[PDB]
Amino acid sequence: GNKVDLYGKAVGLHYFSKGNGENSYGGNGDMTYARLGFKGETQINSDLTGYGQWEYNFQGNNSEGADAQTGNKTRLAFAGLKYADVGSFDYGRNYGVVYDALGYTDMLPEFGGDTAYSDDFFVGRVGGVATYRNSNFFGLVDGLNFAVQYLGKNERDTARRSNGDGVGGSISYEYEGFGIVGAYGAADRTNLQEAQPLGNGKKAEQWATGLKYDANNIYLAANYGETRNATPITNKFTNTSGFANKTQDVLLVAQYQFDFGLRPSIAYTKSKAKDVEGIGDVDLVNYFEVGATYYFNKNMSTYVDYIINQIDSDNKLGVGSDDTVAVGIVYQF
Amino acid sequence: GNKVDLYGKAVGLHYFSKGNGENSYGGNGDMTYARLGFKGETQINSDLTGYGQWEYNFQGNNSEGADAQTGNKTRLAFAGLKYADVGSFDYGRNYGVVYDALGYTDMLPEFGGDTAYSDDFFVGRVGGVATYRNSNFFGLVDGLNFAVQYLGKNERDTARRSNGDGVGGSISYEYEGFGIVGAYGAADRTNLQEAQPLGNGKKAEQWATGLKYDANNIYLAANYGETRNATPITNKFTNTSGFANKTQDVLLVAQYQFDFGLRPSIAYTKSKAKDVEGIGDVDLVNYFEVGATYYFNKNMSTYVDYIINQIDSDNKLGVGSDDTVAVGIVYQF
Amino acid sequence: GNKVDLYGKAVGLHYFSKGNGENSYGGNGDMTYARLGFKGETQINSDLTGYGQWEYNFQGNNSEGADAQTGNKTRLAFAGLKYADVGSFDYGRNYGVVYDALGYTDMLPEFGGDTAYSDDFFVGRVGGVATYRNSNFFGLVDGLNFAVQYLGKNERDTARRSNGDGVGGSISYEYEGFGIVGAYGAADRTNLQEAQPLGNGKKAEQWATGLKYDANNIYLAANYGETRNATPITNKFTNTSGFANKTQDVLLVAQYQFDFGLRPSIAYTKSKAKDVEGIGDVDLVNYFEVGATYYFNKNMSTYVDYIINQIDSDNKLGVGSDDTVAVGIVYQF
Ligand SMILES: CC1(C)S[C@@H]2[C@H](NC(=O)[C@H](N)c3ccccc3)C(=O)N2[C@H]1C(=O)O
Ligand SMILES: CC1(C)S[C@@H]2[C@H](NC(=O)[C@H](N)c3ccccc3)C(=O)N2[C@H]1C(=O)O
Ligand SMILES: CC1(C)S[C@@H]2[C@H](NC(=O)[C@H](N)c3ccccc3)C(=O)N2[C@H]1C(=O)O
């Protein structure tokens, strides 16, 4: 009783921003890529299932010369066990448990999910996490779920990609279309992170909440969160980098799914940093979004996504102000 | 109605050239590699199909240490739609539309296709191309086909791998075994390309024509083409590189397929550069080929390919003069 | 009649060593990874089969930034033919024929097989080998097998990963649970290897013998071997490296497979270098092992592996002394 899904996608994708667009939200140029992965589950007995998943990103916008590997990476690599109503346990490279909140609004055709950074403690995909998850409170309370996650230190060659040990968890409740969730995690920072000119403190923290409605072809969701010493930042001006002492982040999204296959989306996103050494208050992300995806079927879709960027040209970190539209065609299986 | 072919091959491959063979056509040593890819198509309705393909090259001739990734790359990554008799449109990393001509002679057991450079405008695989193709002139003229291709600028870290925007197209006609084709493309060069000591001008151009006969187990084909500011070149002597101001290229191939599985090949290829700054006229490629492939079945083959190199030892760019034989065994699926 | 097995695994894996553990046997931290590969065979006629295999290692313990490719590599890439009772021939990246002996004890849950180095002549996976193998002496003697292997020179950018040409072979005999094997190989060293401060001579050699019993849920095996100018070594102290002039290596392993799925293991391993320039005699590896693997089924397992390291703290090369325990969960297909 083993079942393995070999999956992936090819995505033709182009970003249009004015001129450079090194002063834009998303950049400009070919951004085509493919994904390949497997996910497997084995029925060990009537109450115990084992499972694993690996998922890799192949950029399609590099040449076949020296830059051939730019942006290629494993995204997910983990294995685990799931026992009857007791819960699941898995270990490896997986989603941070704060993403259990941030997923509510990470639903745009192309962009969105701006605060769910990779290799950033609990908010995105990260290496070396053991995660326990529970559905329906041990089978006792329909729609109530929770999880805890143990993050092992990863002392890497860059501050941006490092973390020390930490714990985080999430609780959510869903009932006939509605969902609420909260998530929090904290972890030590490493000395390389502490040595960064931007950001000061011994503990990174991240929390976020989410509300959503997800029924009758409607999707509305909001997330609000804060972080300390956790959101990574650069100042293009002095070329210094590190982490924002604080941030407050909101994301809203509303979307509708027509039966004939079109899926319009509108969204708002803002993330402001505070106490940034040498600057004070500064916006990191601030934009409105309109876009749509058109689904021909489960295997083929196309989409446009337009980012109406509200960052101004005088932003103190050198964050880009110009808009970006992305256009994509997706074959997947 | 989705169908995905997961495909690939393992290729044991060895090159024999005298001594180095840093002064040979193909080099010397282990050249083993594997390929993996998927190609999928989904029947969206009776007149519309979606499709995507990704294809990657894994070298098998690197160690497991620091050089482990040398020559690994995505070859193809694109997705598209094909509507009844109207045509197909796809975007991503795909073959240049000049390759629609150059494919006629790119048929040798191992070598050949010398002017179909990767990441070289329209002649080989390249990133960021939108390609439209038409079969049988909208369903109206059996055997008449055409295509146009829009190439977006790719300003990369090397001149050799860059291009500016351009358009190219191809028309071909096939009738009971015979085929003729022409293809042309032009594109801007980027300032990094223009700053190269070799090659001067604002526009790269490439064109090529092909004739072939391909029936009754016979395969005969010829290509003739020219290029301006498009064929990449190095002078080993001064270690300078860039692009040939002009070239003229011919390739011939003749082959026969025996029913018992052997496929002999003989071929001729010459590409001469002109107006090369500091040199004048110089051969880039000039060789005769004899070789064969033996097909045990659709999944297994073996081959030998011998390149009788006509480049002389006094060639002004430092192009190698010695011969090369390659031997290969191929399992594929 | 083609059959391709697409295979792989996801492995959540963590190493615990004290402090660093840069002075430990195995290190400390997340060591999660995945594997993907295919192996195919095609029935060409009733007596001839073609086959190929490729196998790749994706580390799951890197970030998605610049270090994303650390430790990723192709492990195997080869294709071949197998004719009735005559034998098999294959070429590409494959196991060294000395591994035909060293496999007997390379059976630990996580560690073990310490002398079977990658890209090290005949003892592990290596590029550019043509290998012939024979089963049951041409169909004439049940249980008697042999092989010869031709290794082509690989002059790489590092001494550690290079080899010159060489030949090696192996003979083994198996009868109702017992197995004996011997293997030997020799090859030239390259000038880059010869220029290393550690190791002196023109020929590398490696041999090893093995005994085992493998029936009735018991597994007991021993290997003894020697090497000249072949085992790679570093002195952390002066930061110099190269190859051990001589080594003598023993490995023992005993294991039992319970029907309910547990598989305890105990093992011993020691490898001592001799005539190391500037040092004399020095241990490379010296440890006891206890560990176990628990198999839920063919697709899921878990394991612990504890290495009781006997290298002392005064070891002259700077080889780590501290213990290491590894814990892993494995989903595979
Ligand atoms: C890989 C990321 C650039 S995506 C995420 C976030 N940004 C977005 O999500 C955003 N839609 C975006 C901006 C620019 C180009 C493309 C997409 C950011 O910064 N994180 C990075 C990370 O995870 O390391
Ligand atoms: C990858 C390429 C070396 S192959 C192509 C052309 N050369 C040949 O095709 C030729 N048969 C050949 C010569 C040497 C070794 C192996 C094969 C050339 O130059 N292009 C390069 C490119 O596309 O970047
Ligand atoms: C890839 C290797 C580190 S594994 C092999 C041998 N060591 C072991 O096998 C050992 N169990 C081990 C030690 C440390 C970490 C993990 C495992 C060694 O050294 N060879 C290297 C090679 O092949 O290049």
JSON list of C-alpha atoms in Angstrom, two decimals, chain A residues 46-203:
[
{"chain": "A", "resi": 46, "resn": "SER", "atom": "CA", "xyz": [-4.76, 0.68, 9.67]},
{"chain": "A", "resi": 47, "resn": "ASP", "atom": "CA", "xyz": [-3.67, 3.46, 12.09]},
{"chain": "A", "resi": 48, "resn": "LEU", "atom": "CA", "xyz": [-0.10, 4.41, 11.01]},
{"chain": "A", "resi": 49, "resn": "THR", "atom": "CA", "xyz": [1.00, 6.01, 7.69]},
{"chain": "A", "resi": 50, "resn": "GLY", "atom": "CA", "xyz": [4.58, 7.04, 6.69]},
{"chain": "A", "resi": 51, "resn": "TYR", "atom": "CA", "xyz": [5.19, 9.81, 4.16]},
{"chain": "A", "resi": 52, "resn": "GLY", "atom": "CA", "xyz": [7.96, 11.93, 2.59]},
{"chain": "A", "resi": 53, "resn": "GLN", "atom": "CA", "xyz": [8.16, 14.75, 0.09]},
{"chain": "A", "resi": 54, "resn": "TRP", "atom": "CA", "xyz": [10.97, 16.43, -1.86]},
{"chain": "A", "resi": 55, "resn": "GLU", "atom": "CA", "xyz": [10.47, 19.41, -4.17]},
{"chain": "A", "resi": 56, "resn": "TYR", "atom": "CA", "xyz": [13.06, 21.25, -6.24]},
{"chain": "A", "resi": 57, "resn": "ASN", "atom": "CA", "xyz": [13.13, 24.54, -8.16]},
{"chain": "A", "resi": 58, "resn": "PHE", "atom": "CA", "xyz": [14.86, 24.66, -11.55]},
{"chain": "A", "resi": 59, "resn": "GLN", "atom": "CA", "xyz": [15.20, 28.23, -12.95]},
{"chain": "A", "resi": 60, "resn": "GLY", "atom": "CA", "xyz": [14.45, 28.41, -16.69]},
{"chain": "A", "resi": 61, "resn": "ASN", "atom": "CA", "xyz": [15.88, 31.87, -17.10]},
{"chain": "A", "resi": 62, "resn": "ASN", "atom": "CA", "xyz": [19.58, 31.16, -16.86]},
{"chain": "A", "resi": 63, "resn": "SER", "atom": "CA", "xyz": [21.96, 30.44, -19.75]},
{"chain": "A", "resi": 64, "resn": "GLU", "atom": "CA", "xyz": [23.69, 27.04, -20.18]},
{"chain": "A", "resi": 65, "resn": "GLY", "atom": "CA", "xyz": [27.04, 28.56, -19.16]},
{"chain": "A", "resi": 66, "resn": "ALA", "atom": "CA", "xyz": [28.43, 29.62, -15.81]},
{"chain": "A", "resi": 67, "resn": "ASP", "atom": "CA", "xyz": [25.30, 31.10, -14.34]},
{"chain": "A", "resi": 68, "resn": "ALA", "atom": "CA", "xyz": [23.35, 27.82, -15.12]},
{"chain": "A", "resi": 69, "resn": "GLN", "atom": "CA", "xyz": [22.59, 27.09, -11.41]},
{"chain": "A", "resi": 70, "resn": "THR", "atom": "CA", "xyz": [21.44, 30.58, -10.26]},
{"chain": "A", "resi": 71, "resn": "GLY", "atom": "CA", "xyz": [18.33, 30.24, -8.03]},
{"chain": "A", "resi": 72, "resn": "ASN", "atom": "CA", "xyz": [18.10, 26.41, -8.22]},
{"chain": "A", "resi": 73, "resn": "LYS", "atom": "CA", "xyz": [17.41, 24.77, -4.88]},
{"chain": "A", "resi": 74, "resn": "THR", "atom": "CA", "xyz": [15.58, 22.15, -2.97]},
{"chain": "A", "resi": 75, "resn": "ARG", "atom": "CA", "xyz": [12.44, 23.69, -1.49]},
{"chain": "A", "resi": 76, "resn": "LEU", "atom": "CA", "xyz": [11.16, 20.81, 0.69]},
{"chain": "A", "resi": 77, "resn": "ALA", "atom": "CA", "xyz": [12.86, 17.58, 1.91]},
{"chain": "A", "resi": 78, "resn": "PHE", "atom": "CA", "xyz": [11.28, 15.79, 4.85]},
{"chain": "A", "resi": 79, "resn": "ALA", "atom": "CA", "xyz": [9.81, 12.50, 6.00]},
{"chain": "A", "resi": 80, "resn": "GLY", "atom": "CA", "xyz": [7.39, 11.60, 8.82]},
{"chain": "A", "resi": 81, "resn": "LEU", "atom": "CA", "xyz": [4.75, 9.35, 10.49]},
{"chain": "A", "resi": 82, "resn": "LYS", "atom": "CA", "xyz": [1.09, 9.98, 11.08]},
{"chain": "A", "resi": 83, "resn": "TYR", "atom": "CA", "xyz": [-0.70, 7.93, 13.74]},
{"chain": "A", "resi": 84, "resn": "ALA", "atom": "CA", "xyz": [-4.54, 7.60, 13.78]},
{"chain": "A", "resi": 85, "resn": "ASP", "atom": "CA", "xyz": [-5.84, 10.59, 15.71]},
{"chain": "A", "resi": 86, "resn": "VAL", "atom": "CA", "xyz": [-2.70, 11.15, 17.75]},
{"chain": "A", "resi": 87, "resn": "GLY", "atom": "CA", "xyz": [-0.94, 13.31, 15.16]},
{"chain": "A", "resi": 88, "resn": "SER", "atom": "CA", "xyz": [1.83, 13.54, 12.60]},
{"chain": "A", "resi": 89, "resn": "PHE", "atom": "CA", "xyz": [5.54, 14.07, 13.21]},
{"chain": "A", "resi": 90, "resn": "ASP", "atom": "CA", "xyz": [8.01, 14.98, 10.44]},
{"chain": "A", "resi": 91, "resn": "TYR", "atom": "CA", "xyz": [11.60, 16.23, 10.23]},
{"chain": "A", "resi": 92, "resn": "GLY", "atom": "CA", "xyz": [13.73, 17.99, 7.50]},
{"chain": "A", "resi": 93, "resn": "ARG", "atom": "CA", "xyz": [13.33, 21.12, 5.28]},
{"chain": "A", "resi": 94, "resn": "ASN", "atom": "CA", "xyz": [9.70, 22.16, 5.63]},
{"chain": "A", "resi": 95, "resn": "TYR", "atom": "CA", "xyz": [7.43, 25.17, 6.17]},
{"chain": "A", "resi": 96, "resn": "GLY", "atom": "CA", "xyz": [7.88, 27.23, 9.34]},
{"chain": "A", "resi": 97, "resn": "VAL", "atom": "CA", "xyz": [4.81, 26.89, 11.60]},
{"chain": "A", "resi": 98, "resn": "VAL", "atom": "CA", "xyz": [4.21, 30.72, 11.39]},
{"chain": "A", "resi": 99, "resn": "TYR", "atom": "CA", "xyz": [3.46, 30.06, 7.71]},
{"chain": "A", "resi": 100, "resn": "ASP", "atom": "CA", "xyz": [0.34, 28.20, 9.11]},
{"chain": "A", "resi": 101, "resn": "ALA", "atom": "CA", "xyz": [-0.98, 31.77, 9.57]},
{"chain": "A", "resi": 102, "resn": "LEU", "atom": "CA", "xyz": [0.79, 33.48, 6.63]},
{"chain": "A", "resi": 103, "resn": "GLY", "atom": "CA", "xyz": [-0.60, 30.93, 4.13]},
{"chain": "A", "resi": 104, "resn": "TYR", "atom": "CA", "xyz": [-4.09, 32.48, 4.48]},
{"chain": "A", "resi": 105, "resn": "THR", "atom": "CA", "xyz": [-3.13, 35.42, 2.26]},
{"chain": "A", "resi": 106, "resn": "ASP", "atom": "CA", "xyz": [-0.23, 33.77, 0.19]},
{"chain": "A", "resi": 107, "resn": "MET", "atom": "CA", "xyz": [-2.73, 33.18, -2.63]},
{"chain": "A", "resi": 108, "resn": "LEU", "atom": "CA", "xyz": [-1.91, 35.71, -5.36]},
{"chain": "A", "resi": 109, "resn": "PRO", "atom": "CA", "xyz": [-1.45, 34.66, -9.05]},
{"chain": "A", "resi": 110, "resn": "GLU", "atom": "CA", "xyz": [2.23, 35.49, -8.87]},
{"chain": "A", "resi": 111, "resn": "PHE", "atom": "CA", "xyz": [3.26, 37.82, -6.10]},
{"chain": "A", "resi": 112, "resn": "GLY", "atom": "CA", "xyz": [1.99, 38.17, -2.44]},
{"chain": "A", "resi": 113, "resn": "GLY", "atom": "CA", "xyz": [3.17, 36.35, 0.70]},
{"chain": "A", "resi": 114, "resn": "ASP", "atom": "CA", "xyz": [5.83, 39.07, 1.11]},
{"chain": "A", "resi": 115, "resn": "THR", "atom": "CA", "xyz": [6.60, 38.44, 4.76]},
{"chain": "A", "resi": 116, "resn": "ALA", "atom": "CA", "xyz": [6.94, 34.63, 4.36]},
{"chain": "A", "resi": 117, "resn": "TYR", "atom": "CA", "xyz": [10.78, 34.82, 3.72]},
{"chain": "A", "resi": 118, "resn": "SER", "atom": "CA", "xyz": [12.74, 31.61, 3.06]},
{"chain": "A", "resi": 119, "resn": "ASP", "atom": "CA", "xyz": [15.28, 30.54, 5.67]},
{"chain": "A", "resi": 120, "resn": "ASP", "atom": "CA", "xyz": [13.90, 33.10, 8.09]},
{"chain": "A", "resi": 121, "resn": "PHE", "atom": "CA", "xyz": [13.08, 31.32, 11.33]},
{"chain": "A", "resi": 122, "resn": "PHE", "atom": "CA", "xyz": [9.37, 30.40, 11.32]},
{"chain": "A", "resi": 123, "resn": "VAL", "atom": "CA", "xyz": [7.78, 32.33, 8.42]},
{"chain": "A", "resi": 124, "resn": "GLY", "atom": "CA", "xyz": [8.75, 30.25, 5.34]},
{"chain": "A", "resi": 125, "resn": "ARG", "atom": "CA", "xyz": [10.61, 27.13, 4.26]},
{"chain": "A", "resi": 126, "resn": "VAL", "atom": "CA", "xyz": [13.49, 26.37, 6.53]},
{"chain": "A", "resi": 127, "resn": "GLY", "atom": "CA", "xyz": [15.95, 23.56, 7.24]},
{"chain": "A", "resi": 128, "resn": "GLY", "atom": "CA", "xyz": [16.14, 21.29, 10.26]},
{"chain": "A", "resi": 129, "resn": "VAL", "atom": "CA", "xyz": [12.61, 21.56, 11.75]},
{"chain": "A", "resi": 130, "resn": "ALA", "atom": "CA", "xyz": [10.73, 18.84, 13.59]},
{"chain": "A", "resi": 131, "resn": "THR", "atom": "CA", "xyz": [7.08, 19.50, 13.41]},
{"chain": "A", "resi": 132, "resn": "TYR", "atom": "CA", "xyz": [4.19, 17.87, 15.19]},
{"chain": "A", "resi": 133, "resn": "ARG", "atom": "CA", "xyz": [0.61, 18.49, 13.98]},
{"chain": "A", "resi": 134, "resn": "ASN", "atom": "CA", "xyz": [-2.77, 17.52, 15.33]},
{"chain": "A", "resi": 135, "resn": "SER", "atom": "CA", "xyz": [-6.06, 17.45, 13.60]},
{"chain": "A", "resi": 136, "resn": "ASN", "atom": "CA", "xyz": [-9.37, 18.04, 15.23]},
{"chain": "A", "resi": 137, "resn": "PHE", "atom": "CA", "xyz": [-7.81, 17.95, 18.80]},
{"chain": "A", "resi": 138, "resn": "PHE", "atom": "CA", "xyz": [-6.99, 14.23, 18.88]},
{"chain": "A", "resi": 139, "resn": "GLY", "atom": "CA", "xyz": [-10.18, 13.41, 16.94]},
{"chain": "A", "resi": 140, "resn": "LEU", "atom": "CA", "xyz": [-12.18, 15.06, 19.73]},
{"chain": "A", "resi": 141, "resn": "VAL", "atom": "CA", "xyz": [-12.99, 18.56, 18.43]},
{"chain": "A", "resi": 142, "resn": "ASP", "atom": "CA", "xyz": [-13.90, 18.92, 14.70]},
{"chain": "A", "resi": 143, "resn": "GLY", "atom": "CA", "xyz": [-12.05, 21.88, 13.17]},
{"chain": "A", "resi": 144, "resn": "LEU", "atom": "CA", "xyz": [-9.65, 22.62, 15.99]},
{"chain": "A", "resi": 145, "resn": "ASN", "atom": "CA", "xyz": [-5.98, 22.00, 15.00]},
{"chain": "A", "resi": 146, "resn": "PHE", "atom": "CA", "xyz": [-2.59, 22.89, 16.45]},
{"chain": "A", "resi": 147, "resn": "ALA", "atom": "CA", "xyz": [1.07, 22.28, 15.87]},
{"chain": "A", "resi": 148, "resn": "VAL", "atom": "CA", "xyz": [4.47, 22.82, 17.52]},
{"chain": "A", "resi": 149, "resn": "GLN", "atom": "CA", "xyz": [7.73, 22.99, 15.80]},
{"chain": "A", "resi": 150, "resn": "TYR", "atom": "CA", "xyz": [11.30, 22.65, 16.97]},
{"chain": "A", "resi": 151, "resn": "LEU", "atom": "CA", "xyz": [13.87, 24.49, 14.96]},
{"chain": "A", "resi": 152, "resn": "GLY", "atom": "CA", "xyz": [17.49, 23.36, 15.23]},
{"chain": "A", "resi": 153, "resn": "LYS", "atom": "CA", "xyz": [20.23, 25.90, 14.91]},
{"chain": "A", "resi": 154, "resn": "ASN", "atom": "CA", "xyz": [21.62, 26.40, 11.34]},
{"chain": "A", "resi": 155, "resn": "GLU", "atom": "CA", "xyz": [24.89, 28.34, 11.55]},
{"chain": "A", "resi": 156, "resn": "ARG", "atom": "CA", "xyz": [25.41, 29.09, 7.89]},
{"chain": "A", "resi": 157, "resn": "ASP", "atom": "CA", "xyz": [27.91, 31.28, 6.03]},
{"chain": "A", "resi": 158, "resn": "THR", "atom": "CA", "xyz": [25.51, 34.26, 5.92]},
{"chain": "A", "resi": 159, "resn": "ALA", "atom": "CA", "xyz": [23.49, 36.06, 8.59]},
{"chain": "A", "resi": 160, "resn": "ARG", "atom": "CA", "xyz": [20.53, 36.25, 6.28]},
{"chain": "A", "resi": 161, "resn": "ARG", "atom": "CA", "xyz": [20.22, 32.39, 6.07]},
{"chain": "A", "resi": 162, "resn": "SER", "atom": "CA", "xyz": [21.19, 31.44, 9.69]},
{"chain": "A", "resi": 163, "resn": "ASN", "atom": "CA", "xyz": [19.09, 30.75, 12.83]},
{"chain": "A", "resi": 164, "resn": "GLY", "atom": "CA", "xyz": [19.76, 29.46, 16.40]},
{"chain": "A", "resi": 165, "resn": "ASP", "atom": "CA", "xyz": [17.46, 26.99, 18.22]},
{"chain": "A", "resi": 166, "resn": "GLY", "atom": "CA", "xyz": [13.81, 27.89, 18.71]},
{"chain": "A", "resi": 167, "resn": "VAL", "atom": "CA", "xyz": [10.23, 26.65, 19.29]},
{"chain": "A", "resi": 168, "resn": "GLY", "atom": "CA", "xyz": [7.04, 27.92, 17.58]},
{"chain": "A", "resi": 169, "resn": "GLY", "atom": "CA", "xyz": [3.41, 26.58, 17.35]},
{"chain": "A", "resi": 170, "resn": "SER", "atom": "CA", "xyz": [0.11, 27.45, 15.83]},
{"chain": "A", "resi": 171, "resn": "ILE", "atom": "CA", "xyz": [-3.56, 26.89, 16.71]},
{"chain": "A", "resi": 172, "resn": "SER", "atom": "CA", "xyz": [-6.42, 27.36, 14.28]},
{"chain": "A", "resi": 173, "resn": "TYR", "atom": "CA", "xyz": [-10.12, 26.68, 14.22]},
{"chain": "A", "resi": 174, "resn": "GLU", "atom": "CA", "xyz": [-12.32, 26.26, 11.11]},
{"chain": "A", "resi": 175, "resn": "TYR", "atom": "CA", "xyz": [-16.09, 26.01, 10.92]},
{"chain": "A", "resi": 176, "resn": "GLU", "atom": "CA", "xyz": [-18.29, 25.98, 7.74]},
{"chain": "A", "resi": 177, "resn": "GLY", "atom": "CA", "xyz": [-16.15, 28.25, 5.64]},
{"chain": "A", "resi": 178, "resn": "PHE", "atom": "CA", "xyz": [-14.58, 30.44, 8.29]},
{"chain": "A", "resi": 179, "resn": "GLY", "atom": "CA", "xyz": [-11.10, 29.97, 9.72]},
{"chain": "A", "resi": 180, "resn": "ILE", "atom": "CA", "xyz": [-9.13, 31.73, 12.43]},
{"chain": "A", "resi": 181, "resn": "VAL", "atom": "CA", "xyz": [-5.44, 31.00, 13.23]},
{"chain": "A", "resi": 182, "resn": "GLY", "atom": "CA", "xyz": [-2.64, 32.34, 15.43]},
{"chain": "A", "resi": 183, "resn": "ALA", "atom": "CA", "xyz": [1.06, 31.43, 15.34]},
{"chain": "A", "resi": 184, "resn": "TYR", "atom": "CA", "xyz": [4.14, 32.50, 17.22]},
{"chain": "A", "resi": 185, "resn": "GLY", "atom": "CA", "xyz": [7.70, 31.39, 17.27]},
{"chain": "A", "resi": 186, "resn": "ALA", "atom": "CA", "xyz": [10.95, 32.49, 18.94]},
{"chain": "A", "resi": 187, "resn": "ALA", "atom": "CA", "xyz": [14.54, 31.37, 18.49]},
{"chain": "A", "resi": 188, "resn": "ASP", "atom": "CA", "xyz": [18.08, 32.59, 19.37]},
{"chain": "A", "resi": 189, "resn": "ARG", "atom": "CA", "xyz": [20.06, 34.52, 16.82]},
{"chain": "A", "resi": 190, "resn": "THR", "atom": "CA", "xyz": [23.57, 33.48, 16.01]},
{"chain": "A", "resi": 191, "resn": "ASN", "atom": "CA", "xyz": [26.66, 35.67, 16.56]},
{"chain": "A", "resi": 192, "resn": "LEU", "atom": "CA", "xyz": [26.99, 36.32, 12.82]},
{"chain": "A", "resi": 193, "resn": "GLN", "atom": "CA", "xyz": [23.45, 37.70, 12.87]},
{"chain": "A", "resi": 194, "resn": "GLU", "atom": "CA", "xyz": [24.19, 39.78, 16.01]},
{"chain": "A", "resi": 195, "resn": "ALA", "atom": "CA", "xyz": [27.33, 41.21, 14.34]},
{"chain": "A", "resi": 196, "resn": "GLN", "atom": "CA", "xyz": [25.13, 42.70, 11.59]},
{"chain": "A", "resi": 197, "resn": "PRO", "atom": "CA", "xyz": [24.93, 46.52, 11.63]},
{"chain": "A", "resi": 198, "resn": "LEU", "atom": "CA", "xyz": [21.12, 46.31, 11.26]},
{"chain": "A", "resi": 199, "resn": "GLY", "atom": "CA", "xyz": [19.24, 44.60, 14.12]},
{"chain": "A", "resi": 200, "resn": "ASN", "atom": "CA", "xyz": [20.03, 44.18, 17.79]},
{"chain": "A", "resi": 201, "resn": "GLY", "atom": "CA", "xyz": [18.94, 41.52, 20.34]},
{"chain": "A", "resi": 202, "resn": "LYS", "atom": "CA", "xyz": [19.37, 37.89, 21.40]},
{"chain": "A", "resi": 203, "resn": "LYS", "atom": "CA", "xyz": [15.98, 36.49, 20.36]}
]
